[PDB]
Amino acid sequence: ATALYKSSALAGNLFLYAYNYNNFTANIRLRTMRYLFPVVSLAIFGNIYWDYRSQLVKVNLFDEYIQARAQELV
Amino acid sequence: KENTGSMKKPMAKAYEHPYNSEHHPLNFSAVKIAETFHDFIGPEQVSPHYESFA
């Protein structure tokens, strides 16, 4: 749920840039956003996927241990 | 002699900016924000009644 929301909020920023594409692209007063919007977008994507990826690794480590340790105790 | 006058063919069109529109104006001002604001709050809610609602 958290990864899906943060992905939808990131997609919301992409709409905000598309809805205002002509201004972010042609008006030089907004050049810094045009230049650094994707850097911030990647850093946001990285945090979203990093957390999902790390959580995924831990869940798989947890699942493979309880199965192995259980058979030893049997 | 004046009635015999004619008219030259003018240019077809001037330059069309590819990044300025009436709804998405390129440059900023408080005039366009006013248009978007009064479209949000809507026009004056005119009452047809003889007494106020309250």
Ligand SMILES: CCCCCCCCCCCCCCCCCC(=O)OC[C@H](COP(=O)([O-])OCC(O)COP(=O)([O-])OC[C@@H](COC(=O)CCCCCCCCCCCCCCCCC)OC(=O)CCCCCCCCCCCCCCCCC)OC(=O)CCCCCCCCCCCCCCCCC
């Ligand atoms: C009380 C009950 C409560 C219920 C709760 C719900 C409340 C209602 C919610 C309303 C807000 C959400 C809008 C949902 C759609 C509703 C339909 C609608 O818009 O109204 C009718 C609307 C007309 O509006 P109107 O009121 O009749 O008159 C408007 C005036 O004429 C003036 O014309 P105008 O064009 O200037 O008007 C624009 C109009 C309509 O603007 C639009 O064009 C509607 C499109 C909005 C898209 C929302 C972002 C979604 C991004 C795409 C995700 C796709 C995922 C799947 C991808 C699959 C493919 C791989 O207003 C908006 O822009 C609404 C924007 C809402 C704010 C969004 C802010 C996001 C940042 C905050 C994030 C917060 C987290 C949540 C974010 C959730 C995102 C999922 O219909 C249309 O616009 C037709 C559009 C036809 C062509 C669309 C082509 C697709 C465009 C996609 C953009 C792609 C962006 C870049 C890619 C991003 C993906 C990576």
Ligand SMILES: CCCCCCCCCCCCCCCCCC(=O)OC[C@H](COP(=O)([O-])OCC(O)COP(=O)([O-])OC[C@@H](COC(=O)CCCCCCCCCCCCCCCCC)OC(=O)CCCCCCCCCCCCCCCCC)OC(=O)CCCCCCCCCCCCCCCCC
């Ligand atoms: C499960 C069941 C549960 C649900 C059951 C269903 C019940 C749902 C309830 C709905 C009731 C029906 C709704 C009808 C419309 C809204 C009510 C209303 O009075 O509208 C007409 C009323 C004026 O009536 P009018 O005759 O059509 O206007 C003629 C002139 O244009 C007006 O201007 P004028 O100067 O040319 O003419 C004279 C003007 C002179 O008086 C005035 O103009 C009043 C001056 C106020 C403006 C001063 C600046 C302050 C405002 C700044 C904005 C701050 C808020 C926004 C910023 C934050 C963003 C949220 O009006 C008057 O004659 C006296 C004022 C009316 C009597 C006093 C009412 C006081 C409370 C109304 C405001 C609510 C305050 C918040 C309370 C809620 C607590 C959470 O409109 C307003 O003044 C503002 C309405 C905003 C009301 C919002 C709250 C809605 C809930 C209503 C429930 C009843 C009040 C409960 C509060 C109890 C505290 C004691």
